[PDB]
C-alpha cells in the first residue's frame, strides 16, 4: 500500500481552441520541472510560444510594484495564498502600507520577474505555473 485512493481531476471543465497563426512570446530561461509544467499547460491549450533569450535585468522596487499594481492591482492583494510567507510575515495586516508590501516582496522570491509570457490576450509573469495557468 504505497498510493492512496484519491480522485481529483474529472469535476472540471476546460474550454479552449482556434487556429494557427499564435502570437505568443515567453522570456525565461530553460529550467526542468517548471518549464515542463507551463510547456504542458500550453502545448496541451494549443499555444506555440516563442523562447526569447534576453540578458539579465533587474528592476528597481518602484518598477516592480508599478508593474506589479498596474498590471492587475496594488501589492496588497498580490501574494496569493500559496506564499504561505506572504502571511506569515503578517503582511495580510490591514494596518500596513506599500511601503513595507513592496519591501517584503523585494526580499521575497516572489519578486522573480525574469520569466514573462506574453498573449495577444494579455501579459503577465510565465511563473511559477499558477501565475500562467491564471493568465492562459
Do not use: F, W
Amino acid at each position: 500500500m504505497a498510493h492512496h485512493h484519491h480522485h481529483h481531476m474529472g469535476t472540471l471543465e476546460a474550454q479552449t481552441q482556434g487556429p494557427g497563426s499564435m502570437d505568443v512570446t515567453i522570456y525565461h530561461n530553460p529550467v526542468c520541472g517548471t518549464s515542463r509544467k507551463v510547456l504542458g499547460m500550453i502545448r496541451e491549450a494549443g499555444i506555440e510560444p516563442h523562447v526569447i533569450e534576453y540578458m539579465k535585468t533587474p528592476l528597481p522596487r518602484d518598477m516592480l510594484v508599478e508593474l506589479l499594481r498596474q498590471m492587475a492591482i496594488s501589492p496588497r492583494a498580490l501574494l496569493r495564498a500559496k506564499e504561505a510567507r506572504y502571511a506569515e510575515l503578517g503582511l495580510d495586516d490591514p494596518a500596513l502600507s506599500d511601503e513595507v508590501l513592496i519591501d517584503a516582496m523585494i526580499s521575497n522570491p516572489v519578486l522573480m520577474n525574469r520569466p514573462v509570457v506574453v498573449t495577444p490576450k494579455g501579459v503577465r509573469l510565465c511563473r511559477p505555473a499558477e501565475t500562467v495557468q491564471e493568465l492562459l
